[PDB]
Amino acid sequence: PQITLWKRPLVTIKIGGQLKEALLDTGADDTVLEEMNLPGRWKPKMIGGIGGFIKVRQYDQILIEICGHKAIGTVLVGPTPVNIIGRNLLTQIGCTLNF
Amino acid sequence: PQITLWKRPLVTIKIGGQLKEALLDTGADDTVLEEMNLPGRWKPKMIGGIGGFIKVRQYDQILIEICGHKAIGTVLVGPTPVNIIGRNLLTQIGCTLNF
Numbered sequence: 660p661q662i663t664l665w666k667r668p669l670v671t672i673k674i675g676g677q678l679k680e681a682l683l684d685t686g687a688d689d690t691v692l693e694e695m696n697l698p699g700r701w702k703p704k705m706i707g708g709i710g711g712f713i714k715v716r717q718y719d720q721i722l723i724e725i726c727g728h729k730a731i732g733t734v735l736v737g738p739t740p741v742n743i744i745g746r747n748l749l750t751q752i753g754c755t756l757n758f
Numbered sequence: 759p760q761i762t763l764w765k766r767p768l769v770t771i772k773i774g775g776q777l778k779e780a781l782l783d784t785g786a787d788d789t790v791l792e793e794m795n796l797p798g799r800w801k802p803k804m805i806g807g808i809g810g811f812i813k814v815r816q817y818d819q820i821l822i823e824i825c826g827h828k829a830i831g832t833v834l835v836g837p838t839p840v841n842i843i844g845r846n847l848l849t850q851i852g853c854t855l856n857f
């Protein structure tokens with residue numbers, strides 16, 4: 660689908676057997692999700708934004724269905740205000756910007 | 759133009775007679791730029807993202823030529839790590855997400 664930007668580009672995702680809403684964020688290099696249990700091992704990581712830095716758990720090879728499009732990649736879980744789908748996953752579903 | 763997301767969607771912008779590179783950020787509702795000298799009056803405002811909040815200077819009806827497309831709107835000026843073109847201006851140049 661084509662999405663206009665007059666409202667927040669939120670989409671439904673299926674991850675870890677849970678349904679959530681996430682923001683397709685072209686300004687984010689990485690996918691960051693609010694707290695959950697992504698099954699398997701992780702490695703501590705620190706990520707930064709406009710306001711400073713937050714501590715997240717880095718989970719690799721996580722399956723995520725973004726509006727029915729399947730993708731596996733690194734997913735960081737931590738105190739983000741909002742779920743954000745980053746460019747690591749957006750490339751996999753073939754998402755593009757169009758003026 | 760159509761832009762794939764395998765790299766950061768960086769574009770050149772012209773603002774206040776200054777040439778800069780900015781990030782097409784669908785996750786940003788408003789435009790926020792690193793410190794610069796933008797002519798006119800301003801009003802303090804606080805905006806938040808990952809890691810917390812920053813205090814920015816709000817400017818209204820500012821002209822910006824983004825990748826050859828002109829747009830007028832509010833631009834927030836403050837300690838952002840990266841220049842970001844938000845949805846307030848992305849809609850004027852006709853930007854859409856397509857996957």
Ligand SMILES: CCC(CC)CN(C[C@@H](O)[C@H](Cc1cc(F)cc(F)c1)NC(=O)O[C@H]1CO[C@H]2OCC[C@H]21)S(=O)(=O)c1ccc([C@H](C)O)cc1
Binds near residue numbers: 739785786
């Ligand atoms: C969840 C945050 C999101 C929603 C709550 C809001 N943000 C948008 C998002 O696109 C940022 C862009 C970004 C890119 C960057 F290189 C440096 C930055 F500081 C910010 N990306 C981000 O934080 O990404 C994280 C994960 O990926 C990594 O790479 C990059 C940083 C790391 S915002 O910029 O705070 C923002 C902008 C405008 C407004 C106006 C006033 O409405 C409000 C808030």
